Amino acid sequence: YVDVGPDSVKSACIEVDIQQTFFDKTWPRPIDVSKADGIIYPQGRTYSNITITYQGLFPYQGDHGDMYVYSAGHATGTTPQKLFVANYSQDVKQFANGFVVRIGAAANSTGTVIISPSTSATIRKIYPAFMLGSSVGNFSDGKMGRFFNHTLVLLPDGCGTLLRAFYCILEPRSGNHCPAGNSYTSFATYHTPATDCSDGNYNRNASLNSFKEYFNLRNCTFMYTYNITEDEILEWFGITQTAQGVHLFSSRYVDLYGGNMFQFATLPVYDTIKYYSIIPHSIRSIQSDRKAWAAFYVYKLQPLTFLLDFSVDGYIRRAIDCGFNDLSQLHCS
Ligand SMILES: *[C@@H]1O[C@H](CO)[C@@H](O[C@@H]2O[C@H](CO)[C@@H](O)[C@H](O)[C@H]2NC(C)=O)[C@H](O)[C@H]1NC(C)=O
Ligand SMILES: *[C@@H]1O[C@H](CO)[C@@H](O[C@@H]2O[C@H](CO)[C@@H](O)[C@H](O)[C@H]2NC(C)=O)[C@H](O)[C@H]1NC(C)=O
């Protein structure tokens, strides 16, 4: 097994305030395949200046997906206090064929800081975190969201400059507010921008450390890191699984400005992923440092036949979901 660094030496966890009503917003960003939203590129052949019909894993036209939002935590003028999160940890979803994720879409626009609805701020991109596995159930106090045996965790870190992917048994810790302790509400991750995101010295383990407060990582078969360049550009992330393992997709490395997703990793996870949840993150800012963080959107994948329009340079800038209606069907034919 892999050394993933020391266990947390903390005797308690940070208290977590779950307030789902603050995260219930209607900010629709439905799939528009005309603009090639949510498209994993059919890698393997050379396509250029051509229109084809292709059956693969796609989200459906007009799917609103599931929206998730991360918020600044409670704070006084000087001191971060309780984390502030939605009820995401108890909402375990079926993995099925996997999913794609629209990330950072609202970046640059003006939006509410969530925990203080009357306060607006410029929206910044934030990366999603996921917990995935083969077996789920409840924690000791009865709350849902516990993943058993080896669990895949995808956790961004370093103020959005890396992604960590690791596959470990998650042993719930027993201090106050921890998942095997008293006064448990939800687990979460956090970082503390004042100390973790100072210029030139980003803390590349902040979120991982926060996670290690709620769970001891045991028998990790791997822990990989992927560096990310800092920007506010819209991006797409995807995840699927085959007998070869778990496949991660991103628009970042191959189509940063266009959004087409290409595979960047295959993780040696051969036990079938059946379940996932979104890991809530809360940003331990002080009141005067509060920002708004871009909602992200998760859309389930399914086998569908699309018309794909490949440009001269090889990218897909237009698609049709053939089964959407008879008109689309006709156009595909
Ligand atoms: C920060 O996280 C990294 C993982 O990204 C930890 O890296 C491990 O560090 C130990 C030494 O402490 C090495 O023996 C392992 O080989 C490292 N693992 C990997 C996957 O790189 C690191 O320990 C963490 N740092 C702190 C201070 O906790
Ligand atoms: C937010 O604004 C930034 C800055 O203008 C945008 O970043 C640019 O994105 C375009 C592609 O859309 C690139 O060609 C530029 O090189 C980027 N500039 C920098 C300085 O990174 C960003 O796209 C905007 N985000 C959203 C969601 O609109």
Residue numbers in the entry: 18 to 350
Recite the paper's sentences.
The key determinant of host specificity is the envelope-located trimeric spike (S) glycoprotein, which can be further cleaved by host proteases into an N-terminal S1 subunit and a membrane-bound C-terminal S2 region. In the S1 subunit, the receptor binding domain (RBD, also called the C terminal domain, CTD) is localized in the C-terminal region, spanning ∼200 amino acids, and structural studies have revealed that the RBD consists of two subdomains: the core and external subdomains. For both MERS-CoV and SARS-CoV S proteins, the S2 subunit is mainly composed of α-helices and forms the stem region of the S protein. Here we present high-resolution structures of the trimeric MERS-CoV and SARS-CoV S proteins in its pre-fusion conformation by single particle cryo-electron microscopy (cryo-EM).
To date, little is known about the structural and functional information of NTDs for the MERS-CoV or SARS-CoV S proteins, though its counterparts from other CoVs, such as mouse hepatitis virus (MHV) and bovine coronavirus (BCoV), act as receptor binding domains and their crystal structures have already been delineated. We also solved the crystal structure of the RBD-preceding N terminal domain (NTD, residues 18–353) in the S1 subunit at a resolution of 1.5 Å. However, the glycan-binding site on the top of MERS-CoV NTD is occupied by a short helix and the N-linked glycan on that helix, and thus NTD in this conformation maybe unable to attach the cell surface by recognizing certain sugar molecules, unlike BCoV and HKU1. By contrast, the NTD domain is observed with strong and clear density, forming a stable triangular platform on the top of the S trimer. The flexible RBD regions are located on the triangular edges between the NTD domains. Since the RBD is located between the NTD domains, a strategy to develop neutralizing antibodies, which target the NTD and interfering with receptor binding through steric hindrance should be feasible in the future.
